[PDB]
Design a protein around this ligand. Sequence first.
Ligand SMILES: Nc1nc2c(ncn2[C@@H]2O[C@H](COP(=O)(O)OP(=O)(O)OP(=O)(O)O)[C@@H](O)[C@H]2O)c(=O)[nH]1
Ligand SMILES: [Mg+2]
Ligand SMILES: [Mg+2]
Lengths: 466, 462
Amino acid sequence: KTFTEVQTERLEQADRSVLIKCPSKLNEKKLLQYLSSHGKIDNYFFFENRGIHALIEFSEKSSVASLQAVTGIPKAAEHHVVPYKSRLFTFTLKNPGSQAAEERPVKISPQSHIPVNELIPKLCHADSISSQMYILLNEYQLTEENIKLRYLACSLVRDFARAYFPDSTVKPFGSSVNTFGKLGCDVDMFLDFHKGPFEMEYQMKRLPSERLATQKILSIIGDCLDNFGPGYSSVQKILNARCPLVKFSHQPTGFQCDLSVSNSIAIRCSELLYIYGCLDPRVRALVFSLRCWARVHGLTNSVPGTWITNFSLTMMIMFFLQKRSPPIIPTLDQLKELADEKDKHVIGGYDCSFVSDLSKIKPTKNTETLDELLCDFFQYFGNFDFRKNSLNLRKGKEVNKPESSPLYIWNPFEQDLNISKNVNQPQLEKFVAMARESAWILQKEDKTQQMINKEPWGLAAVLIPF
Amino acid sequence: KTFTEVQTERLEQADRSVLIKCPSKLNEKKLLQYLSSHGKIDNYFFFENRGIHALIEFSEKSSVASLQAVTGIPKHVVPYKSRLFTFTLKNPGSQAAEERPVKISPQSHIPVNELIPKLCHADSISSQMYILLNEYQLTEENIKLRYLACSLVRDFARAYFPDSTVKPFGSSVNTFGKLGCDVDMFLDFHKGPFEMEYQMKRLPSERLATQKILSIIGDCLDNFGPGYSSVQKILNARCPLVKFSHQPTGFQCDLSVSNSIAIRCSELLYIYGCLDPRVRALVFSLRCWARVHGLTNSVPGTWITNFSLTMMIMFFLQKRSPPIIPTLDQLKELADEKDKHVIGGYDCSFVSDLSKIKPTKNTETLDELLCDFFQYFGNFDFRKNSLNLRKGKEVNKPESSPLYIWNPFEQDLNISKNVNQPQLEKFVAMARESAWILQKEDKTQQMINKEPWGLAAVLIPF
Ligand SMILES: Nc1nc2c(ncn2[C@@H]2O[C@H](COP(=O)(O)OP(=O)(O)OP(=O)(O)O)[C@@H](O)[C@H]2O)c(=O)[nH]1
Ligand SMILES: [Mg+2]
Ligand SMILES: [Mg+2]
């Protein structure tokens, strides 16, 4: 299945889904038996976040309308509430003293990964380094339940926008959908907004220039999220940034969210990364471990600045994997060649085209183990000449740097842009030093003796401070 | 019919109506012949406001949908699809054609200067006040245009709040509306073992919710909705408010969240206006009188408001021998359990059926009532007495405000508390001068001398 098919299918599923704040005492079967009267239920689950919440995915969207019909406005807060009716519900018993079935406990689907301290033991008790990186991956990656919750959050924000742009969509991009998302990560959202003798037309208010329109639209949705709600808080409008942005927390799901107007270049990146992530499990294994490594050594940071970003790091990892013998993943120009007329995408002059079908890509013949790749990553970039060379992911080669920035990574979809232009000399040097130390640790450590000594080894040794 | 029946019927008609900005050259018949293919047309008319517009009222609401189906988006824009259309000739340069002129229904009254001659050529003062009334009152076409404006804001509000209604109140629907007046709008909201409810953020008061709602709709009207301009948010007033101009209709509009006290006032005034034509005749002439003498003003302040003046006129009419209109307490008595309306402890109940009210036996002519209005309030002790419209009597003033008129639906509120001593005194003086002019003028000699007389004499500056 292609990225685009997965997006559509996930959004269509979210479109016919709701959230129900459950009561203290909860009989799952009765609730589901009741909710099913409004229509068939394809999927559901429960999770914990300031109480027990449940996601309900109906087979028909009409089921949502049916359920909405019988739902009421909090009688306890009559004229004291903003009567905006969304898909967030709060179920309570009609006759509290008529609970007629055995109350069982419910299975709570986890929405956050276990912390680093708890992860180290599990890594240390693994057999090899490969397995360590697969433990980490499995502990960290997004669950099916979490993904559905992310798409639903998008779907609730969409409903606000459509009020006046009926054909709009709010689509997740970035780590949420590029296969490299870890539990607890932000949800990045793109708003995408576009016979007689008389020529008949609607009267419609015109919009200003692209940027100014984006700012007003995002400002108003921000205001709505803040005031029409429910569950949105810490709504922070950052409309003056290069890319206008609204940040907000969504309390029912517990996500932190970023909303901007659609940038089709950024979506192609997400699809590019999706392909790379789907082509081979080692790709995702390496990313998750190296992201974690960077965070632990203070190379990355939650606030923008001179630090390397996960996006940049992720791109450096793809470049590494492009330069193997033989390559674990193909280059972008190779994917452009395989791209037929169905997959052609030009976005402001530059050809952002590449294949969508995974079948067309021949599998790699590379059989290197993660053990070798992790150390070689550190080895490779530890001894990389960042002053003379830059990273081109189209060619998959080291080339001369168009600009004199310390760390230059060629933006694969735009001609002379550097995705890591923010990075200064100090931060790059610290990365190189951490990379070199990490390689040294791995190359010349006694793995067996450290297991005996009950001390860190392999991935675990590079995931603790120096 | 009752106020409520009229509201529903007008809103149902507006619900299945649209506006069409017509082309320069216009063949009415062809256009209507075309539009009728989408369904039957109960009513239509044309008017003039930065070009020719036409209101089309279909018999079925489905006709709107049919028409909407074939309509296209301007080939940029906020693609909000409402009921405002822009028809143009497919082939402009192949028509005469269409040089047939159309009847323009007027949406504003003729100015005061043009009105004086018509008043001076009347037979009596009664007829003068009926000329003025007829020249000024809302037309059927204008009323439909007002209800339509409400209906478009409703759809527009409904984007976020599907169960909303937008209802006109005030002068638009209390029978005392004159052409060119504002359109006041109230935004109103109306199996198994579980009691299911929405999750909604709790706000400390209705007030704070009202402000946020109106602020967002304002922003949308400004940035998304078509034909709205001069959107002015006044959320800090006693009643939160958004003002805006609606360019297609040319109305100035005021939008607030439903205040049921204000609607009862509108219905109260509707009853009084419907009980007798003299009531409406007196209001329109005395409103015009106040405006001409600078007693009233378009901007709030120390001036008497039309609402206050209108209330003073009702009080006058309550105190006739016999009364031309009944008191509020009399209407409360006749109000059955069907018409009971308590709002905030205070009983805002009164009859809705006009049949239950016995007609007045008063046969006084407008001639006498106009002069007696001036006479009555000219010699009224405003320092000792206040106006109670429930009792219909002069009573001691609960507060020491210069002009005290008892708010009929709320306890110890003064609708004219804004009025100071200077402005009241000027009113009393104008009232006294106006009475004197009328009492001791030679009506016949002034007609001979080609000069003002009667109502016309009190509608020119002194
Ligand atoms: N009780 C009370 N109601 C008021 C007051 N001012 C305005 N209103 C209400 O608000 C409504 C609209 O006010 P306006 O639009 O200023 O006046 P109007 O009665 O519509 O008549 P115009 O002056 O022709 O617009 C009125 O019908 C009143 O019910 C006040 O001081 N007291
Ligand atoms: Mg993110
Ligand atoms: Mg008005």
